[PDB]
């Protein structure tokens, strides 16, 4: 029930970042331990968070014209991550006694924020047909 979410619109990130203030903070509820733990442990959660963040981000811009505006890019990047939320919905496990502690609210620079975006995209690409049985613990 999931087609091809990721598009070539992700190639416009470099342009987008260079067109956003490097000191502008984007709020994103970060899942503690994302760099160390394997994809499946945080992927679903992060995609939901990116979806929320990109939605809020888009609210900060206006649609001007044809030219590749920040609004344009952000809009499309939101579409991608939105589809991923539904594509992670069908693979959502049947939860039983699991309730660590919600994502920490953090703010990142555009550069940092989309680095997280890209990682999520990559972590989704190799999520399919990949060994993930590794139970998500502290290690």
């Amino acid at each position: 029930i999931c087609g091809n979410p990721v598009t070539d619109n992700v190639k416009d990130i470099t342009k987008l970042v260079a067109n956003l203030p490097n000191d502008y903070m984007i709020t994103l509820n970060y899942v503690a331990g994302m760099d160390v733990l394997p994809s499946h442990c945080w992927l679903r959660d992060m995609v939901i968070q990116l979806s929320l963040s990109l939605t809020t981000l888009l609210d900060k811009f206006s649609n001007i014209s044809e030219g590749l505006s920040n609004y344009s890019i952000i809009d499309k990047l939101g579409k991608i991550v939105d589809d991923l939320v539904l594509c992670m919905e069908e693979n959502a496990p049947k939860n039983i006694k699991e309730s660590p502690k919600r994502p920490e609210t953090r703010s990142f620079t555009p550069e940092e924020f989309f680095s997280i975006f890209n990682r999520s995209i990559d972590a989704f690409k190799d999520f399919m047909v990949a060994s993930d049985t590794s139970d998500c613990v502290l290690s």
Partner: protein, 275 residues
């Protein structure tokens, strides 16, 4: 079934105050609690004490039996700061429903409804159904609601209170045939020269399956194709299938078809080559 001491279907506890549930059963196993974000909190004790109860603990609690019986009680942990519980996105399939997850922590309020997040007017045919234990459900979702932001509203002692912005994202109910197009109808060159044909597929979702064919003896499929995709608009997806063959031969000649099929129908456009 197990017997929960606070013998009532619904319980209103104040935020900050202690919250204790107890269920008596000789074959008791565990307590179960569904979080705002679909998660199950477990407790293997008869009595569940919650000191300084937080609004997030609002929800339904279920006492489980070893025989397979269950009894539940819904608890409201009332906090003046948090009248609505937020945190999740708003998704919804076309022609289906969309639950705006904004459950309340205070059921003693009136006019629990939806309103446009910026005070504007809601679509004429937009119909919603309130539910204190889950949120507000949007009935029959249409493509025209894509990108609608809403807010849950409720009147609390005369004054109005609003929740955070909920921006609805809708899934297109694929009910149309794809759209295929190719620049040239027919073209030919001599051997050695490489040729390239770009096929353009248009549809409302990314789910479309597109492919390039080589039909001479029978429609054969070739794997050497470059994929390119873009989101042109809300329900405007576009994929460009590029067929490239290096050093053309007598073997590589004939009619090529670009096939693309939906869960609804299918489309195709053919181009001719002779080398």
């Amino acid at each position: 079934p197990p017997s929960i001491h606070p013998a009532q279907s619904e319980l209103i506890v104040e935020a900050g105050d202690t919250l204790s549930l107890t269920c008596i059963d000789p074959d008791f196993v565990r307590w179960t609690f569904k979080t705002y974000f679909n998660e199950m909190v477990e407790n293997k004790k008869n009595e569940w004490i919650q000191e300084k109860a937080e609004a997030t603990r609002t929800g339904t609690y279920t006492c489980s039996n070893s025989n397979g019986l269950t009894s539940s009680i819904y608890v409201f942990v009332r906090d003046p700061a948090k009248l609505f519980l937020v945190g999740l996105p708003l998704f919804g399939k076309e022609d289906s429903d969309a639950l705006v997850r904004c459950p309340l922590t205070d059921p003693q309020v009136s006019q629990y409804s939806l309103i446009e997040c910026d005070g504007k007017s809601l679509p004429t045919d937009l119909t919603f159904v309130p539910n204190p234990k889950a949120g507000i459900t949007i009935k029959n979702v249409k493509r025209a609601y894509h990108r609608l932001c809403v807010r849950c509203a409720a009147q609390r002692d005369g004054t109005w209170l609003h929740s955070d912005k909920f921006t609805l994202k809708v899934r297109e109910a694929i009910k149309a045939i794809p759209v295929v197009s190719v620049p040239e109808t027919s073209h030919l060159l001599k051997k050695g020269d490489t040729f390239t044909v770009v096929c353009t597929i248009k549809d409302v979702s990314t789910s479309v399956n597109s492919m390039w064919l080589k039909m001479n003896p029978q429609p054969q499929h070739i794997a050497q194709v470059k994929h390119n995709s873009w989101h042109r608009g809300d329900f405007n997806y576009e994929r460009q299938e590029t067929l490239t063959i290096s050093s053309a031969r007598v073997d590589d000649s004939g009619v090529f078809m670009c096939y693309a099929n939906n869960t609804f129908g299918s489309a195709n456009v053919t181009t001719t080559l002779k080398v």
